[PDB]
Amino acid sequence: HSHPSDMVIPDHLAELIPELYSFQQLVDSEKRLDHFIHLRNLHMKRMVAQWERSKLSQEFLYPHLNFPNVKFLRIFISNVSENQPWNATWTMRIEGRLLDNVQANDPAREKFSSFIESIVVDFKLESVKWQYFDGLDIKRVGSENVECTISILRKSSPEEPFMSYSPQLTAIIGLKSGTSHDAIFSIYKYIHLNELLTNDQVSIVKLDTQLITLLPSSLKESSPDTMKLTDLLSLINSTHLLPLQPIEIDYTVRVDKASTYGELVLDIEVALKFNNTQRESQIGAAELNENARELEQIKPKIALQDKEITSVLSNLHESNKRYRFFKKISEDPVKALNECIASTSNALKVLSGDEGYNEDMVRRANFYKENEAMLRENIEVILSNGRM
Template sequence: MSNLSGGFPSRNVRGGGPVPAGSTAVAGENGKVPLTASKQTNPTPTTQPTDTYIPTHLSELVPELKSYEQLKESEKRVDVFLARKRIDLQQSVSQWNNSKSGIVTSHNKNDVKYLRIFVSNIAENQPWQDENNDIQNASWTMRVEGRLLDAQGVQDSTRPKFSSFLQAIAVDFKKPKEDDDDENNEDSKGEGGPKTENQDVDMDEPKNESLIGLSLPMQMPGNPNDNNIQEEKPKSDIADAVEWHFDPINPVDFDGLDIKRNGSENVECTLTIQLKGVTGERLEFSPELGSLIGLSQGSLHEAVYSLYKYILINGLFTSGDNNLRNSANGSTESTTGEKTVVKLDPSLAKLIRQRPVPGSDEPLPTTLRLSEILKLVNIHVSPIRSIKVDYTVRVDKASTYGDLVFDVEVPNFTKQPKDEDEVKREGLSLLSDFNKLTTDLKPQLQELETRNAALLLQLNASAKKYQFFNELSKNPVSVLQEYIASSSNALKVLSGDEGFNEDTVRRSQFYKDNEQMLFESLGVLLSNGRM
């Protein structure tokens, strides 16, 4: 033992000698295992260098080390990002597995098509068409039809009909301003459909087009037997109303809706169209919110997330709590230290001005809590409104076909929505691909880390050589003297010729006074494999 410790005494100290590696400690009478009898653990073998420390003074000598440190910081950020994404993906898959079965819908532009709607009318037996004709025979026919803008032909039996996109449609005819006399009203169907008495419809359309009309009975506001009218129309404005609602029990498919009436004067009306699929999670955003996030419609989640991205990109998060409302309810920062206060810029201030604050004289705030974003968005969203178009039935022209045409967005029914099981499979497949890619890249990354560690060791060795020769060039005499003294001391340590008084080494003061010398001695022994 004295040879290994540079002259330390070899007597056994009180408490017994060390237990050989691999032996089992035995408890004493009191049931406790002696501290000196604990099992020793062999060092873990390694085949690559582990010393990758770079001295700070090398950054001035090697400018590229600053770039290396930046690369290490970027690597840490990438590792954190990938770890977070993996956790998010695992949580999403777990939520899909625990959620109820359902349908996952999407509102991407690829899942949207356009429905082109035509509103027109024709005039028949008008006085300007035949002066000898009786004015009582004058009539007009209003047509509302729609076609999906796609590549399918008109005669294709699988082509979706106009009615398949509608939940309801209504036409409100207003009273004439000068003549309030009652007119004999008559409903009709499109081509190919049965016609009631006194009907004679001849549209300016090819006969082979499938325009299925409907028999729509006249619905007056005061008719107690009418159950189709959802809202009571003002008697002072509405003279006649025609409505159709989708019946899931007895669905009717049609491409066009014809309404025929007697009359020789222009009639103003309002067309209201309620599309299918607009009463769910799809919402309409206010102009103030829409101009800020760049969306006019979407889900509540899309609105909140888009507004959060706007705040994040523009750097509106702040740690100040000035002018915060309800500041006594809690702190402005979470327990994790993240900023939860938003500074209001002019665009966000427009949203705040829309908030109803009845009877309050408080000035507009300049900051807002992040937790209040959802409440703010809820004020600026509403259900998608019905499509309303004002139209004038003109009897001074034979046909107004093409005068009023507009397009509306409709869901793409040909693209079936993904069921939840398919989404789960896609999530599991994505997670599996992520794990497989990580496993495949792990050996390559390990090899790069080994090469990097070897290069760092060479750099440290070169740095030590540079430091020695640099000092030698500045002051050769003192450096050589210090080198000879250090080498002589190392020789004594390795040969065990340096002796110490046994009574002296038993005192703690000896180790305090000779800390530097003992540190160097231990370094010599470790570097030469003697310990």
């Protein structure tokens, strides 16, 4: 029986006991405190939901400057070619050196052998592959010269979502790589600032001269088609996205040069199971559930206190009734001792169910002389209706 009435100490007690204002504005001071927790909770439901939506975005993927999951790794493109008149030797090599405090003869090192997805040196002698050692030692026979396009695939694990884009999309977006959320968001913010949005519905989008070359093979550069945005969002998913990230460098193994074991530079970096663990989209959820468990722990101790608060408030009202009854008697002990009797027998007449006039009042004759007005009405009413 949650009564809203008896949470108020209105006037009669607060004027007598001045601490009740100090009680009441206490309770109001609580009521704006818990509400501050409530706007806190809807805050913490928001930001976590803000960060799980923006988890795919590169606002929290490329900056990891406490510890980024990357270790650089240099590679020498070596070539030893002797026994020629100055059999043209072709001892071409690739050597991997981990950029650390590490050595060259280090046992069990993170080289380009132990950790590389693929290095596909496409030669022009016979092309070689790298199925997922101390170095890449290639040597065939031949006489004139050999040029080899050295192609390095990085460690294209599924947990690095930064993928390359089309050769066209880099010219308009500005990102040589990134995630698919940037590819779905950058053209979205590109549309609004040059009024390519149209209405007939918000779905239609005017194409552009920078957007007809987005789909050159689909033949949309022949007709300036103001099409729906649905075809555009279903266009950039695999027509431009996900090349398994290659790096290229063109060079030839030379006939007369000695070696390139310690002369040439490269730049390829990589561990990866750290930055995808301590993310704010899950740490914030863990903190939210921690605060929820703390709220559900702190709540029954509040309820057991509220029980006693109501049980003391009921006793305060009961004691107020008896204080009023003991004070109105002590002020005038003859008029209160006539109101205590006249409201006790009348309290018995109503509870018994009886009704009517006072028997000792209507038994005299001055009652029918002061009520002379209503009797001349009622006697005519009863007589004219014929009930007298």
